[PDB]
Design a protein around this nucleic acid. Structure first.
Length: 49
RNA sequence: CCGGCCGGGAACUCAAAGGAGACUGCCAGUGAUAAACUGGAGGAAGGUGGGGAUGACGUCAAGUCAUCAUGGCCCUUACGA
């Protein structure tokens, strides 16, 4: 929801699923790029977190 | 006396052919879930892989009567030989 003035009074539910997906799309990107193991796997670390 | 000179062999180089194959088959991004384009792996060859042949109705009364033939015109003691 918008805040009077020009800001946002949002419940972090969004700011976590956004994270679940920012990281998620970046992960699929990192695989089309075919980056080395431990790096894209460190990405799956961030996916499970 | 290694310009394979003499045996020997049938897989290959080469060649005459029956066929496989490459068709956007797969992943991803972009994008109106369509099509399409780019990159990469796969792959002998990749985005109709390259080239020739194939030239849609027509434009130009453009070429050939000098391959030849032809409705006709001229010559037939001739230009015919």
């Amino acid at each position: 929801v918008p805040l009077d003035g020009g800001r946002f009074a949002t419940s972090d539910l969004n700011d976590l699923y956004r994270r679940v997906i920012n990281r998620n799309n970046r992960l699929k990107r990192l695989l089309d790029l075919a980056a080395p193991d431990i790096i894209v796997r460190n990405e799956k670390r961030m996916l499970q977190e």
